[PDB]
Design a protein around this ligand. Sequence first.
Ligand SMILES: *[C@@](C)(CO)[C@](*)(O)[C@H](CC(C)C)NC(=O)[C@H](Cc1ccccc1)NC(=O)[C@H](CC(C)C)NC(=O)[C@H](CCc1ccccc1)NC(=O)CN1CCOCC1
Ligand SMILES: *[C@@](C)(CO)[C@](*)(O)[C@H](CC(C)C)NC(=O)[C@H](Cc1ccccc1)NC(=O)[C@H](CC(C)C)NC(=O)[C@H](CCc1ccccc1)NC(=O)CN1CCOCC1
Ligand SMILES: *[C@@](C)(CO)[C@](*)(O)[C@H](CC(C)C)NC(=O)[C@H](Cc1ccccc1)NC(=O)[C@H](CC(C)C)NC(=O)[C@H](CCc1ccccc1)NC(=O)CN1CCOCC1
Ligand SMILES: [Cl-]
Ligand SMILES: [Mg+2]
Ligand SMILES: [Mg+2]
Ligand SMILES: [Mg+2]
Lengths: 222, 233, 222, 212, 196, 195, 195, 204, 125
Amino acid sequence: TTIVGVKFNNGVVIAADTRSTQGPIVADKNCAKLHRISPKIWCAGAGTAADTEAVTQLIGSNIELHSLYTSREPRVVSALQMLKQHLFKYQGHIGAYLIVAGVDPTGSHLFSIHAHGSTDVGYYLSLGSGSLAAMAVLESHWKQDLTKEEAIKLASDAIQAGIWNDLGSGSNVDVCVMEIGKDAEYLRNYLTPNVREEKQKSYKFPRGTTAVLKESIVNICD
Amino acid sequence: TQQPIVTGTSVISMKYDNGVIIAADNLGSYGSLLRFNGVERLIPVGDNTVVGISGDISDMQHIERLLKDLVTENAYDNPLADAEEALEPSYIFEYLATVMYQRRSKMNPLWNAIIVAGVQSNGDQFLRYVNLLGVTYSSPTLATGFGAHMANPLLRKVVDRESDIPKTTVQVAEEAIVNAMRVLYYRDARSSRNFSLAIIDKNTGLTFKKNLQVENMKWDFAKDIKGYGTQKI
Amino acid sequence: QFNPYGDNGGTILGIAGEDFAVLAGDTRNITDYSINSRYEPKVFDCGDNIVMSANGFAADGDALVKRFKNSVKWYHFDHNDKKLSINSAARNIQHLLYGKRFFPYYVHTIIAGLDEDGKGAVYSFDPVGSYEREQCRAGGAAASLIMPFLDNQVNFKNQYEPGTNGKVKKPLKYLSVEEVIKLVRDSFTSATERHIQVGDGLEILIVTKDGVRKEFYELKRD
Amino acid sequence: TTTLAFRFQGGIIVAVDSRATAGNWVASQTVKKVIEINPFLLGTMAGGAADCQFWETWLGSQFRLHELREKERISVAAASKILSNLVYQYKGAGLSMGTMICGYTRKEGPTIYYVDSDGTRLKGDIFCVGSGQTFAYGVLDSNYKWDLSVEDALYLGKRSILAAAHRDAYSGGSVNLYHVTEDGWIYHGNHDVGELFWKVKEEEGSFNNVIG
Amino acid sequence: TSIMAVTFKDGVILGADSRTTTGAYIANRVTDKLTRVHDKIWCCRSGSAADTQAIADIVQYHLELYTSQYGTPSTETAASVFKELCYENKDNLTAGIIVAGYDDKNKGEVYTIPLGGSVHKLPYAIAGSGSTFIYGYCDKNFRENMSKEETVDFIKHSLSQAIKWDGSSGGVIRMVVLTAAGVERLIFYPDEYEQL
Amino acid sequence: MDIILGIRVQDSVILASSKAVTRGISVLKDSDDKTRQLSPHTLMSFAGEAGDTVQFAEYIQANIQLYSIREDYELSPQAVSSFVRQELAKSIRSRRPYQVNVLIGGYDKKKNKPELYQIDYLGTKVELPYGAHGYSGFYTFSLLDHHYRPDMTTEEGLDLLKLCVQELEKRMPMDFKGVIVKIVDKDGIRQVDDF
Amino acid sequence: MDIILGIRVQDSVILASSKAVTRGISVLKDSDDKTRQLSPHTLMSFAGEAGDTVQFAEYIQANIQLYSIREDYELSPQAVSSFVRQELAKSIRSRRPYQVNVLIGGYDKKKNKPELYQIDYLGTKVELPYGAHGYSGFYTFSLLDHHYRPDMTTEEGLDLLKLCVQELEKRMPMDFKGVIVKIVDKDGIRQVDDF
Amino acid sequence: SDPSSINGGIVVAMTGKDCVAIACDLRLGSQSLGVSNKFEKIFHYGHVFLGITGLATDVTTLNEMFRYKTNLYKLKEERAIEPETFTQLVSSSLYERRFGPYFVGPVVAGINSKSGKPFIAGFDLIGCIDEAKDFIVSGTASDQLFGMCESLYEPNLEPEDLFETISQALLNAADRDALSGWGAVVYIIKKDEVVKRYLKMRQD
Amino acid sequence: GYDRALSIFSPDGHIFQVEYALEAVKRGTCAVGVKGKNCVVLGCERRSTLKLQDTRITPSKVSKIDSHVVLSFSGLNADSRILIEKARVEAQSHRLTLEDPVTVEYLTRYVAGVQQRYTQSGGVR
Ligand SMILES: *[C@@](C)(CO)[C@](*)(O)[C@H](CC(C)C)NC(=O)[C@H](Cc1ccccc1)NC(=O)[C@H](CC(C)C)NC(=O)[C@H](CCc1ccccc1)NC(=O)CN1CCOCC1
Ligand SMILES: *[C@@](C)(CO)[C@](*)(O)[C@H](CC(C)C)NC(=O)[C@H](Cc1ccccc1)NC(=O)[C@H](CC(C)C)NC(=O)[C@H](CCc1ccccc1)NC(=O)CN1CCOCC1
Ligand SMILES: *[C@@](C)(CO)[C@](*)(O)[C@H](CC(C)C)NC(=O)[C@H](Cc1ccccc1)NC(=O)[C@H](CC(C)C)NC(=O)[C@H](CCc1ccccc1)NC(=O)CN1CCOCC1
Ligand SMILES: [Cl-]
Ligand SMILES: [Mg+2]
Ligand SMILES: [Mg+2]
Ligand SMILES: [Mg+2]
């Protein structure tokens, strides 16, 4: 995977590619790596696919119950603390590498979490196999006081660097923008620069090509 | 069977409209210790080729001697040693590529990654890679070590395919290389600020730049960063 | 401890027709998750209407092609410029490979051309020299993806005549050069989608009595 | 692989499959596992494909040189012993070969020799070699008699390979038949298991474990 | 890492680089290794990022609970809590921590806690991979009862050398000043400290 | 423990099990019965790790006999086999798993049909016309593929079984000291004394 | 390769050698003769690693036959055994040693006495009244301790040998497919066809 | 001793115009030894179909487990479980055994009875969901199946045409794998009828 | 090693060393071979200037190469031993690899080949 996070004027934006591997084989050409912990706290995940999904859902569930209990909108630091303490307890065996971001009554935030339970703070971050390709772009083009449209451009460019140059990443670019005072917008397939070309030939077989031994109606009803 | 002791990190390079550019920092690391700081890892051969070497420095110095000796041997009984029968980049590469593969085949490798950059007699740009395994490949941009992971992505934004080479000037190309060297200083734990850069042009020839430094760095934003999560001070 | 072998990825494909033969291969070269080159050819004209590719560890691949090209040269010197027949080339290659039985060339080798009756021929080799003439062969990283597709479309395997109760098989016939290139292009676009080490570009070498033609096609660069 | 050859009243039958594997990957279904060394000598191949194919081809060159030097076809015993002495020199180096040298001469009559890569050399009437050798033995032994006809012997050899091709995951493709007489070897065709299995099931009434 | 803490006339100063690594890749070039466990008790973190963070979080929790019941804890007390965690979990931890704090009675104090979990009270302390290269320098140049400006120069020059030689250290030099006046944060960028 | 076979025919299930018990370079016993009666119309043969085999077989036997007393009813071969599979399926993820392979031959009195189940130590169940565990299968399966017919009698099945034992005695490396044969049908379980 | 025995009696030496050749889970042959005639009054049986056995036996056979032609004379069993021991004693410190154990049974025509030598792959020679290689000895030695007498006839020796084979067939784990028996005496070497 | 490839087997699923198809081979073996040629790998709970490849004892165990769970679901909910919901239940159940997992490669297929939308999905052994518009593959010949499906597949195929495509994908993939084959079954699933067809394939 | 080419051509196309070796044969005691319908007989001369000989132990003129082949000679006695030894070794080597004793033609061809090798090898006569 390639995943990034970029802070801007009035909030934060995160992005991710959509490739899912299984050894050298591409299992899913368009999987969703952007996860919703709460309405305005989102999470980009890299590493063991089941772990990033499971850990994000568990903490997301507990965050919802906490929000109802306290009658308050959830904070990013709460999600951060709950995630890191969970991961640390499992001594790295739960292979989740996360970029946590969102807006809350305190302001806008951007963090990263590693499988062993260490957290880092920053204005721009990148995780996954294509993090070096992405970070190279971020280090070259990032500046202080980015606008919304500039941060989306920088974030998606960093993901593209991973898509093209890293074999672990590919296909499309997902984006989620979290601005202060507004609803978070989830931009599924924000870019689709890897469309499959028309095939040279149709492989529709003449009916009856396959040899059959038995037929039978299956009963699905009661 | 070897293990590398004193080592050199990334070497980066690319093609442009009239020639090729190559660069590499001046560090000789001893594990985590940044032991030697005056190490030149770009070695010119004639006035038309530059060999950039990463990996073990003792093996680099051996290769230096071989190239030095190659120039001597070519001059023997050769009236056109500074003209038609001068050493080409393609000759120098193939020689090294032969040596590297012979050494790996004897289970006693020269623990290096090498990039031969230069210009041929007919004006064509030459840029090709070879390493301890004897593996060879060519591309509009080439880089070793961390450079492969961080520099190539940046350099490929300038020259993504063959047709982008005529469209790329020497000013634009050098700017990209110098930028890449800064990124490597940010992110490679075995890199140094000081580096060397070489340009081989079909018109202006060989330009060798020593004692360059990474500059125009962004560090100011660091002061705003506090704690690792919930600290406010 | 030093490891003398490496994996440079890529995949190759050979198909034979009635009066022609093709040998295709992608132009991508890799190590681990990095791309080394987007255009590094590994299918070569070796003279005497013989095309060759040795996919796998590129250093061993280059060494082998280099030695066979040299073998062809010395065959002319020692035997009065006689044309090296495809069957003779194959047997010679076996001895090159088996010569290093106890320190092998880590490559899958395929050659293509015309036999002495003018008919299309494809031979394939394992790393230590066992060989076999076939109508059809894929080799390299995505061989397991492409090969069963070829069984189905080139040799009409598992295809029966419609309405014959799976009793009459679909009859074997030679394919036109136009139809074969269609299958090659579709095979490589499919392999590019699902294998990370396959992409960037496709280079096909076609072999007829007139000589050796080339064709190039773009592939997805992610 | 699965290969067999047995001696009987009417000479020697030799039968092999045609599959080649690299782990669980079925690499080929059309491999020629019988080498025709000369009009009176055959060799079977099991184990490492390159090892078998290279050395049994080399073997035929040595036997050609024998008849040039001695003005006489090489004996089956001498032929098999050249191979066994060769592989013995490479003992421990990691060659993988399970071979059977089958042929006829005047002095010996019909003869079969088992030769493998750890140096074992055995004369005998019946042998099965390969990963599916046990499956072939089961059918072959339970139906074998010396007084089989040429027609029945050919079928039993074919049927024994089919049995192994079915059960052994690393055997299959097609059956190659050979018959060796006083006049030399005779090829009895390539038989694809795809069609042969169903033809045998219907006509013989066997293979009741399979869904018809 | 390269980290150090130095006592002086008016209190104590903590110092650190900003580099976090995965092998040879710098995962974070602007890391803050100086962290607050109490108003005027801070620590320098070296070793595993995950372990030192987990530990520092637990210590902050303990000292917050201590304050609620018994008032402000001593610097010695804080070091004892760090020790208790590091010693009792020595088999599962990779943490080299320097504890530094300012009392009004005891003034500036520095306690260092190596891998084993042992406690050592010192006038000044150095630790982390890059500390090996400055034992000679720091021993020759340290004096007791230095001024604020002198101590800042001592830490700056020391960490500058540690960074110069250690590949596992780099980025900016962060510092935290602990005195009766309050808490002051300082930062120093490469362009300044490299050419010292 | 080594050779256990099973053949289902028209009206019965026939189990054959080797008599040898070997440990080291000594055959300690040549008359061992590697089977337990689970119920009047259900028989289980077993083979595997020393100790584990008998301990497991008797544990199953006790449980099925307990069920029979409680409900005053005989469980079907299908039900018994499913119980056995689950016990092995639990076992494989235990601290120390049972390393036992079994064949369950039974006659279902409600369906009036013979049934043969093959279950390995992992808990892998399959119903078969003929079955075998261990190296035996590598000879007997291909043999039975050829000679087996579904409508055979018990006498035809015993001849078919003799054909298997002969092949094993010819081609197997170890001396397994012959077999004990038992038949399961509508009238229950009985042993063939002369084989 | 597995079972080789030897018994020296009053006027002859008797060697017994198993007929089975096994590889994996298959008995490839059940009529193998694990012996070579070195000279008219000297016989050597062998057992050990596949290939090594026959290669070694024939190499010795060639050397002894060469000596016989050169000198027009037959070497004594004692002389042959010492030659064999030295070849094995060289072998053990080679790059790849012969892993072969042998028994040499011969009749010395000058002394008019039968002689039996046991030599292992290390080159360890001993003259014995009765000998065995491999696991066979663990049964046969104690048996022969009890039943053997020095003044026995050839017929008494064959009965004594039958008593050994019976015990091995009862208690050995592997089926070795019987034995080929050969007698060495004043009249040379001959094979017993019905054993 | 690699649990996922001891017994062998494959499963594949595809979508079409207002229909779905799921297919599997019939082999169960012990490494090289083929044991059974009747071992089906596709099960169904109401109108939701589940295929499972991998270690056979776990295939059986999980079938029994999901039958158990879907039966309790139906009693309490008073309706049949839908493919989208069932997918989540499978994921939950597998991840519950995160550090001692069932060695399986399950595949869900079915049509949602409310919306009428065709649905397919795949999982890894610890429960990661892989949703797809086009096709899902699983088993010892997954590489082969990926290659066949990616080239042969086109969208919006009619049930009769879709049958040919999925059948040819399974057959030609199985013939390039030693541990897969020995017979095959294909399920064609329309909104309110389901046809099951046994394929004739080579028996080696 | 001693390399000298002792057997060489002369202007008239003769190899004198080979021809002088024939003179040594002409000096040697007579030997005769006659083959019948079902047998072969080898006759040999023994010079009678040697009395007080011990015929039990004195080397015999006819030598067995194998149990089925014999070799007699004329010329230098010491030389003959070397050929006989090489022949006897080759005889056992043939039985070992071909599993069949040598033919008389083969054994002759081998011995003749050895004799030829000494006519164009350096350092030997
Ligand atoms: C980039 C693309 C690569 O790093 C991203 O980081 C993505 C993250 C996305 C998916 C959130 N990572 C992957 O795609 C990830 C790479 C990976 C593989 C293996 C271990 C760790 C990371 N791939 C996966 O997680 C796949 C998801 C599939 C496609 C549904 N799962 C697997 O590859 C599983 C790994 C399961 C596992 C077990 C124990 C510890 C860690 C992971 N592997 C298999 O299923 C392979 N095999 C199938 C046959 O049954 C045996 C297991
Ligand atoms: C039955 C079918 C199986 O036992 C037979 O015994 C046949 C005998 C026939 C072919 C004469 N045996 C094989 O098919 C044999 C099995 C085998 C494999 C490897 C070692 C020993 C035995 N298969 C082969 O020899 C294959 C044939 C190729 C695929 C056509 N060859 C390989 O696997 C080669 C060579 C292996 C090797 C041996 C010795 C030294 C070095 C290498 N290896 C590869 O092709 C590697 N691999 C294939 C998959 O793709 C990635 C690379
Ligand atoms: C200097 C740099 C060294 O002493 C400092 O002490 C800093 C201290 C600060 C950051 C608090 N130490 C590190 O930066 C520390 C060095 C280190 C590495 C490994 C073990 C102990 C210490 N780095 C880390 O902790 C990183 C931080 C991540 C990148 C945010 N973590 C890793 O490198 C993980 C840790 C796993 C681990 C191993 C042993 C004990 C505890 C945790 N290691 C990996 O991910 C391994 N990596 C996998 C990819 O291939 C390269 C190796
Ligand atoms: Cl940190
Ligand atoms: Mg098979
Ligand atoms: Mg530094
Ligand atoms: Mg198959």
